[PDB]
Design a protein around this ligand. Sequence first.
Ligand SMILES: CCCCCCCCCCCCCCCCCCCC(=O)O[C@H](COC(=O)CCCCCCCCCCCCCC)COP(=O)(O)OCCN
Ligand SMILES: CCCCCCCCCCCCCCCCCCCC(=O)O[C@H](COC(=O)CCCCCCCCCCCCCC)COP(=O)(O)OCCN
Ligand SMILES: O=S(=O)(O)c1cc(N=C=S)ccc1/C=C/c1ccc(N=C=S)cc1S(=O)(=O)O
Ligand SMILES: O=S(=O)(O)c1cc(N=C=S)ccc1/C=C/c1ccc(N=C=S)cc1S(=O)(=O)O
Lengths: 539, 539
Amino acid sequence: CSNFFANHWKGLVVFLVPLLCLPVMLLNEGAEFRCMYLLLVMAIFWVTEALPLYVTSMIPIVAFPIMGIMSSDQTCRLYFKDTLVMFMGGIMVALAVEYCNLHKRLALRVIQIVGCSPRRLHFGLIMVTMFLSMWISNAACTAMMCPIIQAVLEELQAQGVCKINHEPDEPPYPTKITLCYYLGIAYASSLGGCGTIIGTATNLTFKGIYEARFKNSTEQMDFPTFMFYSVPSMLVYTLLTFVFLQWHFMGLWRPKSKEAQEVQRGREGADVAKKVIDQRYKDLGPMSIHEIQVMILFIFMVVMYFTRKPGIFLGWADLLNSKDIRNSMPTIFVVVMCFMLPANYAFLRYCTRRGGPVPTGPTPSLITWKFIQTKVPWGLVFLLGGGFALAEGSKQSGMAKLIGNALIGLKVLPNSVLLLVVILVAVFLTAFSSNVAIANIIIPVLAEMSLAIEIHPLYLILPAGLACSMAFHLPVSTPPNALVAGYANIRTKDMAIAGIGPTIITIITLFVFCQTWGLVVYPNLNSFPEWAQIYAAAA
Amino acid sequence: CSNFFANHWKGLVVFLVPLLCLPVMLLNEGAEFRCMYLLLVMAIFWVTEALPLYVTSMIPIVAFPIMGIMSSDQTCRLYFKDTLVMFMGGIMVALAVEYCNLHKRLALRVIQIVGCSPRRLHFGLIMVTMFLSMWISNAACTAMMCPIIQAVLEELQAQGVCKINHEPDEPPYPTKITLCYYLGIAYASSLGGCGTIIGTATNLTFKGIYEARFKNSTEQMDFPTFMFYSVPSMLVYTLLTFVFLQWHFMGLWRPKSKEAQEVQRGREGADVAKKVIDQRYKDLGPMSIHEIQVMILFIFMVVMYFTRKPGIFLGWADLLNSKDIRNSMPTIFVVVMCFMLPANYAFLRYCTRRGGPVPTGPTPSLITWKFIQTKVPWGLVFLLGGGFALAEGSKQSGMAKLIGNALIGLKVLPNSVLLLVVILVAVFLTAFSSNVAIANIIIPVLAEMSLAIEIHPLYLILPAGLACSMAFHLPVSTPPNALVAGYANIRTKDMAIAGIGPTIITIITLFVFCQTWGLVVYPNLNSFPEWAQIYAAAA
Ligand SMILES: CCCCCCCCCCCCCCCCCCCC(=O)O[C@H](COC(=O)CCCCCCCCCCCCCC)COP(=O)(O)OCCN
Ligand SMILES: CCCCCCCCCCCCCCCCCCCC(=O)O[C@H](COC(=O)CCCCCCCCCCCCCC)COP(=O)(O)OCCN
Ligand SMILES: O=S(=O)(O)c1cc(N=C=S)ccc1/C=C/c1ccc(N=C=S)cc1S(=O)(=O)O
Ligand SMILES: O=S(=O)(O)c1cc(N=C=S)ccc1/C=C/c1ccc(N=C=S)cc1S(=O)(=O)O
């Protein structure tokens, strides 16, 4: 009976896939193919959610020492790197913000400014998120923006506009509005990261690779030039992504279905919403010292993030250069300071003697550990560590060299087809792995290939370098996806279906604006310059 | 203003202590003094519990990179080492045991065997824990035995004998009987570790140091001789520790409230308790496939623990020698296998068609991630990683060499006084640091100093090597204490007060049995052998 398959397919996958993928290991002798087998099995498990994602991420610890790739002590330390500490600290600080009810104040202020229309609110949030992510790391922006979205959704539910969760082990399912807002936040962060060389680590990585490999080159990837080259495309496909998201979930062009909610909100928003929102804001009262301290700490953390080695002026990392200090220091500093500081300052009435009442007990701090344990999604440690460890193991085993030597066979294709195929390959590879690792794998091969067939290296390097960052399908592809999926339970199926669109939008936009607008910034992109001839003759 | 001190002393300590400890860095020059300042501040925070322990353990991440001792990336990677993964996996497997109600079955079986008297049950549990900890790592035994103690306490409460917790945001306070049981488990593991070379890593460490430093030695610390030397003392002070614990938490020799509570137990539970217990056991059905599978996995895990490179026979770690498997493999393997396997095995009715309704749904696994997230104390990650990070920082900064040089000046004292002072110093230094670390910092100095004066090296090395493992005062001293404090909410003051007994008992017992019984096992211990003279002359 097919009912058997309908009920117990997950166990069938778990039991059958390794045996079916065994020939990959058995037919080939090198150590590379064992790592390839492991990667294939994990990918198949990730796509179908046969096992919980966190459990699947634990496999490398068992697998690598047996395969002979890395020692057990070396594997376990690849998890819990510096960047992972930064992510977890960001989550903790966001929880601290949520604890003092600051997010409700910000959400009410925003709704009061914009006008209480779900469409306009969505547009404003997307634009603000993109602009912020243009300057800071993506995960920080996503973790910052999650509670604000939560508060806005709660307000809309309170007005009776929409329901956050589907009506009834398994956590509650999210409604289409929730998916729209959260996926919008994540995609906006990922898209806005590409605007500036400070936006994400991938830009710095491939810029450094290009500068090191090619010197004595006329073209420069200077800070203003890169922004001049990248911003217009960013704007165009950000707007197109917003429109697609509105069409998919809110029925923008179709008044047959789902239009009822937005029109119903629009009709009553003119008077009732305006009369109610301001009163609710008044009911909060003046901002208290608790929130002032939390806000000051958050602003300090962001400023410290921005001013560490910005590249356009001296940074505080240049001072204190005895040992390499990275971004985890300010975050943990803030987390500790949250516990150290008090929340009232009402006890000074003893020394001042001006005040009558006394606390009659210890003054609570800014946050409590019981709150942090209950809310933090501790499973993310294994997922992100699995990504890092898998990348490092792929480096050491020798599979990255295998892929690089595999790609060299694309010299036959004409130029435009070659560019399109390169973009597609970059997207497909980055779907399953860290962006930085994919860039390291791909760029040098492209440089050598370009020198082989007499093409200006930038013409191929820049589109691929940008394309490495376009990942929208799976929670493992990029940290913002994982954070959003953890915060509000989002299943993989819905997110892949939703992401099927921005992939096409970004590919087409990147192709067209490259081939057309890149000439304006770099006039000699089509021609093959002299210094390239010198390098080719040398090689 | 006395009430002000009574209420707000914690924050007063937090504010004042760093300023008062600043002269340590200010007056002295080297980096080791900065490391010493950090260690002193963290110790004072640990003792008074001004901050949560988990928060205090985070300070090294901020402190070390600023002081220039270590880079930021290395410090974070020192956390979450291999051994920490082993501990966390052990906790997860214990939770898996708790999920399927196996612990109740084991507890009822034990109560049937022993006889349902709190005193006799406590004695039996202590002896069993000691015997197991002879052969396995201590943390494994503690994580093994926590749920069993929980189940036994629940049964006794259901009989109306005692109450686990005091009558009510903070977690509940445990009563005296709970403290007695849990502290007994932890102390029993620590004490029983010293019996055998395999028992703990400290024994292996100092045995290896002695063998490497002094070849050509007549006396041998092989497997049987060490056991012959160590077992009798271990039995004596285990028994004395049990007697002290009974005296302190129950009225063993005092007419008190606790004395009445225990003494009344025998009257009502002469035979009614036996009848009720047998009825309750018969109420439970026969073992299901769930419990059988969990038990098989647990036994497999323990066997893999034992058979990895023992001295007496060949181990599986010697095979697969390409990389160090290093014992994390079995634990994570078991954890993953728990999620992979099913629970009912009733779906085979499709193929066999023997009879019975089809499940009409997915079959649940052995455990669920929601259960794991709720129960595991996740702060233990930071609390245990702090020890490794702090130890490595101490090695690199240069503190350890400073302490070793400071220890030389003791050579002026006579022999027995020297032995006593050595034992005291070893205990004091192991209460704020990892046991293995203190051994590496103290043993070579003792070897050289014993060569300098005319003393047999074993006479000093062996008692100190045993003494390094006696830590009973703080949750940070040794992993069993941390696990017990996490599982049942135990404040530091109670543990610190209770730890006075075992410290004195062990110190006196080692002193006396060394000086008396050691000569029987190793004759000519007092005299200076020939090879010692050769080694001393060649210096
Ligand atoms: C020494 C190493 C190997 C140890 C192996 C131990 C286990 C041995 C076999 C135990 C019995 C398995 C019986 C399988 C019968 C065929 C499949 C029947 C249908 C089926 O898959 O039903 C699911 C059970 O599957 C399952 O139970 C699938 C998992 C089976 C065990 C895991 C095997 C992994 C092998 C990995 C290594 C391969 C070789 C590498 C060199 C329940 O389906 P459901 O949807 O109702 O429930 C999903 C879970 N909740
Ligand atoms: C960050 C944004 C700040 C914005 C401005 C906010 C206002 C000023 C904030 C700083 C104020 C510092 C001085 C506060 C008054 C201290 C009065 C005596 C101590 C006292 O009241 O003790 C507790 C408060 O402690 C405390 O309040 C001490 C908290 C820790 C202070 C810093 C400690 C480290 C200083 C040295 C660092 C560098 C060392 C050298 C490298 C009482 O409260 P409680 O004990 O009942 O409850 C504590 C929570 N549970
Ligand atoms: O990829 S590596 O772990 O080798 C790495 C080496 C670096 N060497 C230097 S300097 C600097 C960064 C770095 C990794 C960073 C990321 C790796 C994967 C990410 N997403 C996924 S999956 C996101 C980041 S991010 O924090 O940079 O955005
Ligand atoms: O302490 S060290 O990080 O130097 C260390 C070096 C090793 N080099 C090698 S091979 C092997 C193990 C090892 C650490 C072991 C422990 C360190 C601290 C502990 N408690 C505290 S605080 C308990 C243990 S345990 O593993 O004995 O349980």
